[PDB]
């Protein structure tokens, strides 16, 4: 049959749905809307094999293909962080950019305290998914991290990027995991990073699909074909492409910014629905990072201030 139609007619619902359930946090049909339509999408693609694709809505609850598990070397290694435990740590990071370059704006985020991943996508499709591994060399479990919702399939421009996102395991749903963990005479898992490790870590990507996993998108490995010209920029510019971002970003013109930042989340992080570490301060202009560069461990031109 040709079913052209409704096959679009789905995939365009039920990525609209899953993009509001996961992405936004908005629904706009109920549970049983989703439900519905994904059970008819399964049987057409049962009954009618022709119709399934590498991007199906379908993709979502996991297939009979297996993560390799294949040591696996990034495009680009993903950096690592330098630590700042106090206010003085930071007036210093603040004080030898100034001496530097000059005055700049920082760009606020919160530090995810997730598993930091490796996300390749080639003509705007997701093609390999990374652990961060040593930084250089990953593990790849592409099946696995091809159920998280947050996670596109396809992005809105054909491009060949690497983005650098931190995969978790919403705290709420890690809760209700120890319950049903606790009520099921099993081990309970020790917080939401342990919990999200051991779904991504499944060689069964049906069993990671119905844990309740999640991204934040923090970085890109190349900005070439990207219009930003600063980080906060370039995290608005992965919204509109197709990325889960974390909303709580600021830009700050200085320190006492990124401190009062800093106060703020402390006394606010208690009510996110994920865990925090941290918080990452980014030197937020292009061009000014470039300027800072590396030493032969970390950015000069970043920082995460861990919590106490
Ligand atoms: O544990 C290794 C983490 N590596 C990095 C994480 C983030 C990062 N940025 N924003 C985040 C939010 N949550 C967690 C991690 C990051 N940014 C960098 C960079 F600045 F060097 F590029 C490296």
Redesign the pocket.
């Given at each position: 049959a040709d079913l052209s139609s409704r096959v679009n007619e789905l995939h365009d619902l039920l990525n609209q749905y899953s993009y509001e359930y996961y992405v936004e946090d908005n629904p706009s049909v109920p549970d049983s809307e989703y439900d519905k339509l994904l059970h008819e999408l399964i049987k057409i693609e049962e009954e009618h094999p022709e119709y399934k694709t590498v991007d199906s809505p379908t993709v979502r609850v996991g297939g009979e293909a297996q993560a390799s598990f294949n040591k696996v070397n990034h495009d680009t290694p993903?950096?690592?962080?330098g630590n700042a435990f106090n206010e003085d740590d930071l007036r210093k990071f603040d004080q030898r950019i100034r001496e530097q370059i000059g005055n700049v704006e920082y760009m606020c985020?919160?530090?995810?305290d997730?598993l930091?991943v490796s996300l390749k996508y080639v003509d705007g499709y997701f093609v390999q998914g990374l652990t961060?591994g040593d930084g250089t060399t990953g593990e790849d479990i592409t099946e696995n991290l091809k159920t998280i919702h947050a996670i596109p399939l396809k992005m809105k421009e054909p491009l060949n990027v690497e983005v650098?996102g931190?995969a978790y395991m919403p705290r709420r749903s890690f809760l209700r995991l120890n319950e049903e963990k606790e009520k099921n005479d099993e081990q309970l898992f020790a917080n939401p990073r342990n919990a999200a490790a051991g779904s991504l870590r499944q060689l069964d990507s049906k069993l990671t699909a119905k844990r309740k996993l999640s991204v934040?998108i923090?970085?890109v490995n190349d900005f070439t074909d990207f219009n930003a010209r600063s980080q906060s920029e370039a995290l608005d510019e992965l919204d509109k492409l197709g990325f889960t971002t974390?909303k709580n970003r600021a830009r700050v013109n200085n320190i006492d910014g990124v401190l009062e930042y800093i106060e703020k989340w402390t006394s606010q992080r208690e009510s996110l629905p994920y865990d925090i570490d941290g918080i990452?301060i980014?030197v937020n202009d292009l061009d000014q990072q470039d300027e800072m560069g590396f030493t032969q461990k970390?950015?000069r031109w970043?920082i995460?201030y861990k919590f106490p």
């Amino acid at each position: 049959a040709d079913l052209s139609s409704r096959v679009n007619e789905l995939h365009d619902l039920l990525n609209q749905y899953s993009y509001e359930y996961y992405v936004e946090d908005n629904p706009s049909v109920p549970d049983s809307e989703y439900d519905k339509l994904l059970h008819e999408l399964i049987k057409i693609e049962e009954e009618h094999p022709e119709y399934k694709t590498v991007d199906s809505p379908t993709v979502r609850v996991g297939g009979e293909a297996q993560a390799s598990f294949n040591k696996v070397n990034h495009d680009t290694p993903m950096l690592s962080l330098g630590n700042a435990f106090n206010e003085d740590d930071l007036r210093k990071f603040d004080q030898r950019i100034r001496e530097q370059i000059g005055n700049v704006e920082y760009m606020c985020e919160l530090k995810i305290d997730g598993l930091a991943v490796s996300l390749k996508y080639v003509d705007g499709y997701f093609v390999q998914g990374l652990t961060r591994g040593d930084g250089t060399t990953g593990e790849d479990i592409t099946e696995n991290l091809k159920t998280i919702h947050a996670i596109p399939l396809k992005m809105k421009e054909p491009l060949n990027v690497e983005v650098r996102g931190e995969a978790y395991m919403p705290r709420r749903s890690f809760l209700r995991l120890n319950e049903e963990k606790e009520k099921n005479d099993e081990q309970l898992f020790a917080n939401p990073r342990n919990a999200a490790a051991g779904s991504l870590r499944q060689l069964d990507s049906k069993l990671t699909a119905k844990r309740k996993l999640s991204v934040f998108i923090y970085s890109v490995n190349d900005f070439t074909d990207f219009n930003a010209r600063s980080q906060s920029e370039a995290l608005d510019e992965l919204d509109k492409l197709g990325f889960t971002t974390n909303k709580n970003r600021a830009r700050v013109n200085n320190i006492d910014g990124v401190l009062e930042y800093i106060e703020k989340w402390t006394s606010q992080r208690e009510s996110l629905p994920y865990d925090i570490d941290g918080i990452v301060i980014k030197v937020n202009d292009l061009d000014q990072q470039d300027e800072m560069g590396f030493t032969q461990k970390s950015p000069r031109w970043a920082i995460a201030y861990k919590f106490p």
